[PDB]
Amino acid sequence: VNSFSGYLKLTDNVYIKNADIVEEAKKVKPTVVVNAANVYLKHGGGVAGALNKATNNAMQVESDDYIATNGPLKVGGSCVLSGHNLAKHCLHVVGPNVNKGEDIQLLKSAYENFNQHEVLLAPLLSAGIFGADPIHSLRVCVDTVRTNVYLAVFDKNLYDKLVSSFL
C-alpha cells in the first residue's frame, strides 16, 4: 500500500490522474517526483518551471551547481537531485523536444530511467511544451516502465482523451 489517492489504474503498474503535479507532490511527498527537464536543467516553463517555482528557486540553484560540475545531460538521460519541499528526490528526465527537432525514438530511452525507481510520481514525458503527442507518450510509458508510476495530467480535457483512447 502507498499514499497515492484517486488514480485510475491503466495496467498492472501504471496509474493516471487529472492533477497538478506540484499540488500532488506537496500533498503526497513521494520518494521520487519526475521533472520534465532539459539537458541544461534550465527550469523555465512547464512542469520544471512550475516545480522549480514551488521550491522557491532552490531546484534551479542546485541544478546550476550540478551542470557547472558535470555538464549537460543527454537527451534521453536523467540525474537524481534533491526533491526539496516536494519529494525525497527529483529524477530530472530529458525527453526529446519535438519543437527543437529531437528524435522521438529517444522517448523510450527517457522512460527507461523510471525503471531505476520502484515508485514515481511523473508527468507524461515530451508532452506539453516539448511538443510530442501525449497519447503516444502514454503508450511508450506503458510499454517501457515496469516500476509503479503515478502519472499526473494537468489538463482535464487531455486526461479524459487519454483515458477514453487507452488501448
Q: How far is the CB of 68 from ligand 3HP (least distance, A)?
A: 26
**Beta carbon nearer to ligand 3HP, 96 or 128:** 128
Name the residue nearer to ligand 3HP (CB basis): 5 or 70: 5
Residues 4-43 that bind ligand 3HP (CB under 6 A): 36
Q: Does 140 bind ligand 3HP (CB under 6 A)?
A: no
Q: Say which residue the cell 510509458 belongs to.
A: 141
Considering only 124, 140, 141, 149, the residue that binds ligand 3HP (CB under 6 A) is 124
CB of 123 to ligand 3HP, least distance (A): 4
Residue numbers at the binding site for ligand 3HP (CB under 6 A): 36, 46-47, 123-124, 127-128, 134, 153-155, 158
